[PDB]
Design a protein around this ligand. Structure first.
Ligand SMILES: [Mn+2]
Ligand SMILES: [Mn+2]
Ligand SMILES: [Mn+2]
Ligand SMILES: [Mn+2]
Ligand SMILES: [Mn+2]
Ligand SMILES: [Mn+2]
Ligand SMILES: [Mn+2]
Lengths: 97, 82, 106, 99, 105, 94, 85, 99
DNA sequence: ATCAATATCCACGTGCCAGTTATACCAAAAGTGTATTTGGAAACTCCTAACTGAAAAGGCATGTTCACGTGAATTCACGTGAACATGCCTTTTCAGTTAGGAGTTTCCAAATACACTTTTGGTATAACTGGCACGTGGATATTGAT
DNA sequence: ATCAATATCCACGTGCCAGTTATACCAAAAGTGTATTTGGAAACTCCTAACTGAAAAGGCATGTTCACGTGAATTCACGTGAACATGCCTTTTCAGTTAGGAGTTTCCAAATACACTTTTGGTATAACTGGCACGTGGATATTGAT
């Protein structure tokens, strides 16, 4: 019998590391930290967006719920740059169809 | 009289709050330090409350907006909705 | 010639996987198409910000491989990442070297 | 002829008066004037439900009174009776609101 | 032809708790027992606070509970105070407490 | 043409059962309504996470029970679990 | 089969507590600090282990997992990175 | 003739040493016993993933180091350099861990 | 001690408004009974990893000695908050305009739902090597005695 | 200041193992396409309740006087740090054992999905009164001066 597949973000974290420090690697314990960080930030944003939709009696979480959650959770400059990256990713995703 | 609104939170009012907090003697520098704290607290809460308002496409900050903001800051408030 | 939603969005983070976790996590009844895209971009961004600051700390310590100590120095020395992760513990990360001035001699 | 209570006697009377009561201790109009000013830096032409401002005032006064308790403990820990800015600063640091 | 609250023996709306669970995005499915259990827990805790708050009103020689009596009831009970340690009761005030070193003589 | 729910009706019912000759002001009722909604979201939120942790789709009364043990302090948890098992028993046989 | 466990809070040695104060930037340590720290640590460990085992029981498991500890730490506001999701 | 560093020199050297490093400062096996003693007096016949015990030790040492930082500020605030139990108690009271 | 000024109870009278009581619609739940679907408890068996135990060594814990700097106690000077009476302007309490919250309604873009196809991520084995950890000696910095 | 003891920094070479790399296998997601459903943006209108304005109410600003709390200075007993001898128990690496975690499959109690019935809780309007806020006198306690 085969042990089930344990997903992680390690493949994606490693790519980002290569765009940012092409000559730098990462230890498994450091990779473990990063997987905790991404899952933590995911659930924070998705959780805040969930309450946004409910507070306004909306059954759908959109890019607009995610953006407001990013503004609520991230501090100043981090939110400014995160908003631009998200707004940019969505417009690119829309027109590319 | 042209004076700031943060000075509208007056010295005897700050003195009253310290009394409810059980304070017997108040240094003069406390009053400027307190207003700085109060301003920071309100900015953090009003920023989040206004963010809820903008998302609801409204121009009226509701008491629920304030309640949702306080809860996010770990300052859960009872008696103004929900 | 199909293409993943990640590439279509310009992302290195998996939009499709993020979409699955939004539905599987019981956050709402329905998920817009833009939500996983936007959220995957934010996650990819923050990952880049930490890895840049950590990669520098690893360079300052004459190491080529990021370790938890580097992620700790990176986070604690950046005021906005510190605030974001102020209630977080990084296993094997340690603390920032800091000595109260009154404790030094002379 | 005039009567004078010794310093600290009235202050202990004030503590007992204000710990017994529950009324808001900041004046409404300066406070409401402060709320609209702070929000103006975040969004323009804003209106406030009257209960929204009251909610803010109850939360703010509760926050400040609670901080004065911790501040008072810091002063007393330093073998003092007077709260000083370093007392407030120490309480806010240990609370994790700063540094 | 009876309501689930009566069938469970509860003053609290079992049927309403069930609706709030499904519409709250807590899980895909809600068992038939969960809204009963949850309604019973909520009813118990309301009774606990209202009991202690009723005493506080009687001790102020008052017949009608006001927020002050709810504040006095909670901050004086060790466990409700723990359960509501990070909660602010509007128009509740604070418990009378003067540090000993601040008294004269 | 607008309606708003609350717990005031059931709160007042519980008040008469514990203090028959006692009233409750409106402000006190708003605080009691906030209390119930708070404890509701805490218990349901914890139960949701319990289900997700164990790859389950159903919030059963066992989830509500473990959430109660996790959220209430010592003795309050004991009596709440008791009153909870009491209501589900009486509901099952009737 | 296994030997009775008792008084293990004294395995938190006086040098070990000193080392922890050092990482915390402490220069001089009063003699009473050591038993106060054991009491504080014991309370902290109990609360976490209590929640952890409750997660273990609810999963009808006999083994406390790292995820059990991580979930327990999370709900006490001590989020931990590096031991699973 | 025999060399002696003055009281404080080695302590500051140790501060620099341990703030520089990341390893766990409590011995592994004594800590594992403590976990097993506590857990077993709450529920019998329990086993532990080794990672679960390391997770607990990382949490405790992180918690204690942080508490010692806050403790050190309380002592310095009282014009001492020696942490005392009342410093720890004040730190935990302001943190709300005891209040 | 004897006083007197002021604060604080106490027992009682007063009017008013927020609370209690009741009633009538009534839509929106909540319930009932049916058909229908499914999660996850139950079997079983595979296999991971937790536990046990040996055994050696050396990294630390322990306990002791000794000096000295730290915290605590005490005294003293002076300056800063507390107390207070004053002069009055700011907040508080009322009125009649509308901004916009919130309901209702339509209908299209956008979501879910199915089946089917493609590929991408994770596991695993073998393989590999360069990064780091360790040990050394050797030149440099720091500390304490003088 | 000079000096010596000691710690510290850094470059050096070492073996080793975790990280990197590359093979194939493959199931499980993900992507694509179709028909189906629907949430909620958009008009518009309604109707609170937030804003403005003006006129009254009482809290705040001001300056003076001095009680006394704070910080500075000085002493000193002794608790705490540094150093050291001793050896114990943690740590380390290997082995074998089986508990219990986890994977698979079956199948039934309990879930959802309707449609339909029934009633409950919210609203509203009118009514109602007693609980509570507030003012009173006058007896006592408190406080500070003497
Ligand atoms: Mn035991
Ligand atoms: Mn000293
Ligand atoms: Mn308009
Ligand atoms: Mn691949
Ligand atoms: Mn020994
Ligand atoms: Mn078995
Ligand atoms: Mn009814």
């Amino acid at each position: 019998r085969k042990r089930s597949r344990k997903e992680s973000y390690s493949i994606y974290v490693y790519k980002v590391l290569k765009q940012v420090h092409p000559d730098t690697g990462i230890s498994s314990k450091a990779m473990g930290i990063m997987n905790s960080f991404v899952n933590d930030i995911f659930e924070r944003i998705a959780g805040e967006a969930s309450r946004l939709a409910h507070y306004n009696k909306r059954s759908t979480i959109t890019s607009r719920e995610i953006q407001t959650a990013v503004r609520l959770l991230l501090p100043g400059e981090l939110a400014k740059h995160a908003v631009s990256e998200g707004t940019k990713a969505v417009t690119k995703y829309t027109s590319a169809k | 009289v042209l004076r700031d609104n943060i000075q509208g939170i007056t010295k005897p009012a700050i003195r009253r709050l310290a009394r409810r907090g059980g304070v017997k003697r108040i240094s003069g520098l406390i009053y400027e330090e307190t207003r700085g704290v109060l301003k920071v607290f309100l900015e953090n809460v009003i920023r989040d409350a206004v963010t809820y308002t903008e998302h609801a496409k409204r121009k009226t900050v509701t008491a629920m907006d304030v309640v949702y903001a306080l809860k996010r800051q770990g300052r859960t408030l009872y008696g103004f909705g929900g | 010639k199909a293409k993943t939603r990640s590439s279509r969005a310009g992302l290195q983070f998996p939009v499709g996987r993020v979409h699955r976790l939004l539905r599987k996590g019981n956050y709402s009844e329905r998920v817009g198409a833009g939500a996983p895209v936007y959220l995957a971009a934010v996650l990819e961004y923050l990952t880049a910000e930490i890895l840049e600051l950590a990669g520098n700390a690893a360079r300052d310590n004459k190491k080529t491989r990021i370790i938890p100590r580097h992620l700790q120095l990176a986070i604690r020395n950046d005021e906005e990442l510190n605030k974001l992760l102020g209630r977080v513990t990084i296993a094997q990360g340690g603390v920032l070297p800091n000595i109260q001035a009154v404790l030094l001699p002379k | 002829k005039p009567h004078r209570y010794r310093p600290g006697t009235v202050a202990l009377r004030e503590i007992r008066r204000y710990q017994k009561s529950t009324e808001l201790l900041i004046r409404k109009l300066p406070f409401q004037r402060l709320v609209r000013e702070i929000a103006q830096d975040f969004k323009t032409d804003l209106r406030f439900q009257s209960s929204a401002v009251m909610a803010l005032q109850e939360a703010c006064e509760a926050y400040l009174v609670g901080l004065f308790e911790d501040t008072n403990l810091c002063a007393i820990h330093a073998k003092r009776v007077t709260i000083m800015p370093k007392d407030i600063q120490l309480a806010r640091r240990i609370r994790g609101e700063r540094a």
